[PDB]
Design a binder for these strands. Structure first.
Ligand SMILES: [Mg+2]
Ligand SMILES: [Mg+2]
Ligand SMILES: [Mg+2]
Ligand SMILES: [Mg+2]
Ligand SMILES: [Mg+2]
Ligand SMILES: [Mg+2]
Ligand SMILES: [Mg+2]
Ligand SMILES: [Mg+2]
Ligand SMILES: [Mg+2]
Ligand SMILES: [Mg+2]
Ligand SMILES: [Mg+2]
Ligand SMILES: [Mg+2]
Ligand SMILES: [Mg+2]
Ligand SMILES: [Mg+2]
Ligand SMILES: [Mg+2]
Ligand SMILES: [Mg+2]
Ligand SMILES: [Mg+2]
Ligand SMILES: [Mg+2]
Ligand SMILES: [Mg+2]
Ligand SMILES: [Mg+2]
Ligand SMILES: [Mg+2]
Ligand SMILES: [Mg+2]
Ligand SMILES: [Mg+2]
Ligand SMILES: [Mg+2]
Ligand SMILES: [Mg+2]
Ligand SMILES: [Mg+2]
Ligand SMILES: [Mg+2]
Ligand SMILES: [Mg+2]
Ligand SMILES: [Mg+2]
Ligand SMILES: [Mg+2]
Ligand SMILES: [Mg+2]
Ligand SMILES: [Mg+2]
Ligand SMILES: [Mg+2]
Ligand SMILES: [Mg+2]
Ligand SMILES: [Mg+2]
Ligand SMILES: [Mg+2]
Ligand SMILES: [Mg+2]
Ligand SMILES: [Mg+2]
Ligand SMILES: [Mg+2]
Ligand SMILES: [Mg+2]
Ligand SMILES: [Mg+2]
Ligand SMILES: [Mg+2]
Ligand SMILES: [Mg+2]
Ligand SMILES: [Mg+2]
Ligand SMILES: [Mg+2]
Ligand SMILES: [Mg+2]
Ligand SMILES: [Mg+2]
Ligand SMILES: [Mg+2]
Ligand SMILES: [Mg+2]
Ligand SMILES: [Mg+2]
Ligand SMILES: [Mg+2]
Ligand SMILES: [Mg+2]
Ligand SMILES: [Mg+2]
Ligand SMILES: [Mg+2]
Ligand SMILES: [Mg+2]
Ligand SMILES: [Mg+2]
Lengths: 228, 51, 148, 53, 157, 185, 124
RNA sequence: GCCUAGACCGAGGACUGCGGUUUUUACCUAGGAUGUUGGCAUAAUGAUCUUAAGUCGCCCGUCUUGAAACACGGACCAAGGAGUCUAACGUCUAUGCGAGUGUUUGGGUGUAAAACCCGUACGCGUAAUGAAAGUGAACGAAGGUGGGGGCCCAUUAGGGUGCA
RNA sequence: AGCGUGCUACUUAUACUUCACCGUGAUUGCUGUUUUGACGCUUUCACGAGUAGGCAGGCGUGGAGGUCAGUGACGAAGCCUU
């Protein structure tokens, strides 16, 4: 008992010091999250103002093309040709209802085009990204799937990339940042459930023709609401 | 031993995102926007109604 | 031990590890070295080249005793010096008194010249020596004395 | 490209600034504003079927 | 079974439980449960009896009286989940229910003289207030049952 | 179902313990299981793997190899480490004074180390005078000089040894080994 | 749970695993044998066929080997065999061998009661 | 932002962590269920057997691309019943010794087919190549270069030494 | 309750999500507290179809060396038995 009370007092002192040091880090991440919120709102209002001004000035504001996409594999693992199978493996989509974040370039666009008959993908909103990371967000730590239940896991794995919080990670994903590759690869592929409300009557046809595969764009957010 | 959803557990939410407190305190989710009662589409954008 | 063989583990499985189509038959392919020129050519050509044909001349009534000539190299030659006196000989050897090494009496026929000798005169008695073995022995101040 | 990268790197070292040499795949284009002076939108419709033989 | 001996490293000590963080929080009663409300008992000996709700005890139970003269249902506790809370109400501001608690119903046939006296004292005020509403005493003295064609998902109580 | 990108339930393919049931070899593994787990010294982690190796994977190190390894520049007073048997070499002309730690020594090898002023210690004696393997030098014997390796990867124009019981002019030298008898491979 | 406390004992399968067609033919005993036939409906796991042994039915390692009273049962032959259960009387129970005589069995029961060892078969 | 209906689950087992509230070296919903009440212990509870009902379930073994097959064996039961031993070998592994190794053909010895002991030869290895007569393995630290675990000097980096 | 087409809700696979348990592979840590099990204990994650066939870990049998100074005519073995 004596040893336990001695080590408890030592632990209490060390925890006092640790908490005092961590308070500053939590202030830092608070400021970063507030700044991220400010720039999100400012960018949204700026885009709205630009659209209104172009409407007023007999012009047309063309939105910037989306730089990020969320891809969900809605097809099983049977009867897949070798090339789309390899493409789905390289996207880390090796099961049904697996989701991944992709930064849009020519290379990744031609990749997603190869997997198009087997996936549903689209442009995720900020709230959808946040909900995904909060409920089903896992990290790859020593080749293990670890829940993101504390900011220390994110700091210990992405502090060399200036990611100290779950909000730093969400910001880095949403506004596609200079370290998007490392941040998205640290995230284990999201394992979603089936939709509450079901799919359309027949999944495996393009969204344009009344099916589920292909690009649904902003309705991926509704789909994620069904599945997350 | 048991993953807790920050969207259900408020304490875990504050553990992960301390700014949620300010978000809750300031009512950022229902923030008003100050703007004018203007309508700038009265002119050539009425090309949408007919052409 | 029979309890360690895989025959005990194949019990209960129909074919006993021999296959259901291929099965285990008497002698598919023939017995012994059958078919070495026709359907086992692919085996003998790959793994035993030179098997078929004649090379060289015969030797009726060959007595291997005629060709007895065990070899000893130079790097193993000083092991024939007495173990209790090796270190003293390596020091006090000179042109006036060098150790005698009777290689034939130790069971060797020819002295070969692999390795390097101590820079020490020796008297080597051999039935046969190579050109370089004797050149190395003379270089350390030694000599080869032919015996029979 | 090796020579061009070497020239850009030394010129950035000379100017004391930085330059990025990794190639990039083509990215989605940014926002833009379309002027309609002389380019008022023309309305099209699908055309009826005709035989030309 | 077999001859497998226990080992020296097979300890028999029982570890202490971890410190549980299930700190209890107060019971949240239904909004319809207000003292003076007429209740319908669904289970127990007095199932189907219309009774008067008097006090919320600290055991999460409800203090209830018939009154005993009208019904035969005495002062006792019931569980809130075995009760239908109707819309009929009796003014119980004139009824003293201070002395009633969990220890009153402690387990010690016979019946205490104290309990009989308390029954009369509570029932005097209860009957005095019940007489004001016509047919309320008759309503309380009648048992409840579901008639043919009664749909509890459509009925108001 | 899962689309597996790698084989499932695959053993590491490396020995995690000696195959030997020698209790005294176990004690050395016991000692270096603790050292490799707790010292961060790469020397102790290499030794633990080497104690698992099979007989053909720990070839004998001749006392000539130690002499040649000690003749590197600045390695004359290093501690020679051999995870295996150290054998004698009667082709050496001289041996230096050296400290050598090995699993086993032959009678000739031990006689040669102590005659020249050296020490022949075991690997447990090594762990006290060098618990981090400071100033050591691991020596491994030749693995590909084995006779069994002569026949590995045999084929046409491969230059390997035929699998044969007798040697001579009548044994696998005519057709396929000679252009006068058809072809040569 | 008069024994050392344990989790609730779960037996994943409580029926006997009976060999296929041990009911059709007397020569086929109920002792489980895996069907190896090419066309076998049981080996191919058709719907409606018998359950088969697999590692999924394995017992919880915390409740494995425990009798309904929560004890592990140890086979006892002579009175000296109870000595190994001295420090395990609340987690291990003794079962008296069938071939112990009526004399020695009374001595084992008497000493086990003295030592506190529980006896699973107290009447026979 | 707020209220509200239901279902399933409760793994873990002194403390340790991150937060929150701080009224506090204290408290909390924050590293996994507790509190309270009733009943039962001649038993509520659980299992098995038999049987009924619901639903599904074609005869196994075999050869076959394909078997429940209008393909073959099998009426039933008990007992027996099928990859063995040997000579010589390939790979891998363990062990003893190690440039040597193998006592067991034989000799000594014996408490007598055992155990214990002994040594010359011989086999294999220590040299290859050529059909053969024959000849027969260091220019050099037994070589150079690029890597190369480990070790040494350092001080990110870097250098030295570098077995397999 | 047919045909073409649109819409709302609903039904259910050994599939998907969360959770329990079994096994396999990896993985965290464990000797001045290693403490009579280190061929042992422990943290965590992922995975589990299979003929022919390979390997591993086990169950059972006749007989043998050693041990339990084991059971047994006060009943061994065998046999029958919700
Ligand atoms: Mg402690
Ligand atoms: Mg990706
Ligand atoms: Mg639904
Ligand atoms: Mg629908
Ligand atoms: Mg459908
Ligand atoms: Mg066996
Ligand atoms: Mg098998
Ligand atoms: Mg099989
Ligand atoms: Mg059969
Ligand atoms: Mg086979
Ligand atoms: Mg067959
Ligand atoms: Mg065959
Ligand atoms: Mg021939
Ligand atoms: Mg699976
Ligand atoms: Mg995987
Ligand atoms: Mg080499
Ligand atoms: Mg050879
Ligand atoms: Mg021949
Ligand atoms: Mg020719
Ligand atoms: Mg069951
Ligand atoms: Mg059972
Ligand atoms: Mg059941
Ligand atoms: Mg069978
Ligand atoms: Mg088939
Ligand atoms: Mg009997
Ligand atoms: Mg529990
Ligand atoms: Mg923190
Ligand atoms: Mg039925
Ligand atoms: Mg049917
Ligand atoms: Mg047939
Ligand atoms: Mg056939
Ligand atoms: Mg046919
Ligand atoms: Mg059939
Ligand atoms: Mg037919
Ligand atoms: Mg046929
Ligand atoms: Mg036939
Ligand atoms: Mg017959
Ligand atoms: Mg017939
Ligand atoms: Mg019949
Ligand atoms: Mg063999
Ligand atoms: Mg010989
Ligand atoms: Mg010899
Ligand atoms: Mg020359
Ligand atoms: Mg080099
Ligand atoms: Mg219709
Ligand atoms: Mg499952
Ligand atoms: Mg399931
Ligand atoms: Mg210690
Ligand atoms: Mg399997
Ligand atoms: Mg299998
Ligand atoms: Mg097993
Ligand atoms: Mg046996
Ligand atoms: Mg027999
Ligand atoms: Mg015996
Ligand atoms: Mg006896
Ligand atoms: Mg009978």
């Amino acid at each position: 008992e004596k040893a336990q009370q001695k080590t408890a007092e030592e632990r209490a002192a060390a925890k006092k010091v640790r908490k005092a040091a961590n308070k500053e880090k939590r202030k830092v991440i608070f400021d970063r999250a507030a700044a991220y919120q400010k720039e999100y709102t400012e960018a949204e209002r700026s885009v709205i103002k630009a659209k209104r001004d172009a409407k007023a000035s007999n012009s047309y504001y063309v939105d910037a093309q989306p730089k990020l996409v969320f891809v969900v594999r809605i097809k099983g693992i049977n009867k897949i040709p070798p090339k789309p199978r390899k493409v789905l493996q390289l996207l880390r989509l090796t099961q049904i209802n697996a989701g991944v974040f992709v930064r849009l370039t020519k290379a990744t666009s031609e990749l997603i085009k190869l997997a198009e008959p087997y996936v549903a993908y689209g442009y995720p909103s900020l709230s959808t990204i946040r909900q995904l990371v909060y409920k089903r967000g896992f990290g790859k730590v020593n080749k293990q799937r670890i829940a993101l239940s504390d900011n220390a896991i994110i700091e210990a794995n992405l502090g060399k990339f200036n990611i100290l919080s779950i909000e730093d990670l969400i910001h880095e994903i949403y506004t596609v940042g200079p370290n998007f590759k490392q941040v998205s690869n640290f995230l284990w592929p999201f394992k979603l459930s089936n939709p509450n409300g079901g799919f359309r009557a027949r999944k495996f046809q393009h969204f344009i023709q009344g099916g589920d595969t292909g690009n649904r764009e902003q309705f991926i957010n509704a789909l994620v609401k069904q599945m997350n | 031993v048991l993953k807790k959803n920050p969207l259900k557990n408020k304490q875990v939410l504050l553990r992960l995102n301390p700014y949620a407190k300010a978000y809750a305190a300031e009512k950022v989710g229902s923030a008003k926007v100050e703007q004018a009662k203007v309508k700038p589409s009265k002119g050539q954008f009425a090309e949408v109604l007919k052409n | 031990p029979t309890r360690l063989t895989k025959t005990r583990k194949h019990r209960g499985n129909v074919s006993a590890g021999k296959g259901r189509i291929g099965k285990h038959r008497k002698h598919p392919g023939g017995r012994g070295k059958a078919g070495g020129q026709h359907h086992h050519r692919t085996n003998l050509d790959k793994y035993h080249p030179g098997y078929f044909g004649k090379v060289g001349m015969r030797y009726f009534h060959k007595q291997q005793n005629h060709f007895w000539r065990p070899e000893i190299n130079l790097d193993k030659l000083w092991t024939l010096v007495d173990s209790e006196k090796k270190d003293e000989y390596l020091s006090k050897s000179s042109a006036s008194a060098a150790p005698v090494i009777d290689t034939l009496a130790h069971g060797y026929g020819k002295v070969l010249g692999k390795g390097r000798l101590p820079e020490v005169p020796v008297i080597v008695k051999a039935r046969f020596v190579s050109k370089l073995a004797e050149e190395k022995i003379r270089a350390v101040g030694g000599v080869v004395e032919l015996v029979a | 490209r090796v020579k061009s990268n070497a020239a850009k790197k030394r010129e950035a070292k000379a100017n004391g600034e930085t330059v990025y040499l990794k190639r990039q795949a083509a990215k989605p284009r940014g926002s833009r504003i379309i002027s309609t002076e002389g380019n008022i939108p023309q309305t099209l419709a699908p055309v009826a079927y005709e035989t030309f033989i | 079974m077999s001859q497998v001996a226990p080992k020296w490293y097979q300890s028999e000590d029982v570890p202490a439980p971890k410190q549980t963080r299930k700190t209890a929080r107060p019971q949240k009663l239904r909004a319809s449960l207000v003292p003076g409300t007429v209740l319908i008992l669904l289970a127990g000996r007095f199932r189907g009896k219309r009774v008067v709700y008097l006090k919320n005890l600290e055991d999460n139970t409800l203090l209830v009286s018939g009154p005993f003269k009208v019904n035969g249902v005495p002062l006792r506790r019931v569980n809130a989940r075995y009760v239908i809370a109707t819309s009929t109400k009796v003014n119980v501001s004139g009824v003293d229910v201070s002395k009633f608690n969990v220890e009153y119903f402690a387990r010690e046939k016979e019946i205490k003289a104290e309990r009989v006296a308390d029954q009369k004292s509570v029932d005097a005020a209860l009957l005095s207030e019940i007489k004001k509403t016509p047919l309320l005493k008759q309503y309380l003295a009648a048992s409840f049952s579901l008639k043919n064609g009664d749909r509890p998902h459509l009925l108001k109580f | 179902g899962r689309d597996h990108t790698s084989k499932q339930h695959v053993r590491s393919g490396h020995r995690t313990a000696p195959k030997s049931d020698n209790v005294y070899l176990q004690l050395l593994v016991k000692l270096y299981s603790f050292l490799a787990r707790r010292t961060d010294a790469p020397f102790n982690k290499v030794i633990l793997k080497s104690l698992f190796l099979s007989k053909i994977n720990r070839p004998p190190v001749s006392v000539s190899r130690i002499s040649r390894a000690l003749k590197q520049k600045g390695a004359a007073e290093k501690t020679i480490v051999v995870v295996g048997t150290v054998t004698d070499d009667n082709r050496l002309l001289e041996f230096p004074k050296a400290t050598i730690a090995a699993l086993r020594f032959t009678a000739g090898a031990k006689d040669r180390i102590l005659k020249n002023g050296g020490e022949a210690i075991t690997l447990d004696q090594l762990a006290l005078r060098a618990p981090k393997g400071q100033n050591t030098l691991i020596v491994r014997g030749p693995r590909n000089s084995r006779e069994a390796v002569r026949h590995f990867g045999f084929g046409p124009h491969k230059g390997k040894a035929p699998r044969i019981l007798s040697k001579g002019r009548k044994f696998e030298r005519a057709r396929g080994r000679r252009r006068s008898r058809g072809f040569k491979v | 749970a008069t024994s050392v406390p344990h989790p609730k004992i779960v037996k994943k399968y409580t029926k006997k695993f009976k060999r296929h067609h041990s009911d059709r033919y007397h020569r086929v005993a109920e002792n489980w044998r895996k069907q190896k036939g090419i066309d076998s409906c049981v080996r191919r796991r058709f719907r409606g066929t018998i359950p088969q042994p697999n590692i999924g039915y394995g017992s919880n390692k915390k409740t494995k080997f425990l009798n309904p009273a929560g004890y592990k049962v140890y086979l006892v032959k002579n009175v000296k065999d109870l000595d190994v259960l001295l420090l395990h009387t609340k987690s291990y129970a003794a079962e008296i061998a069938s071939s112990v005589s009526s004399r020695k069995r009374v001595e084992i029961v008497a000493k086990a009661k003295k030592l506190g060892v529980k006896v699973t078969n107290p009447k026979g």
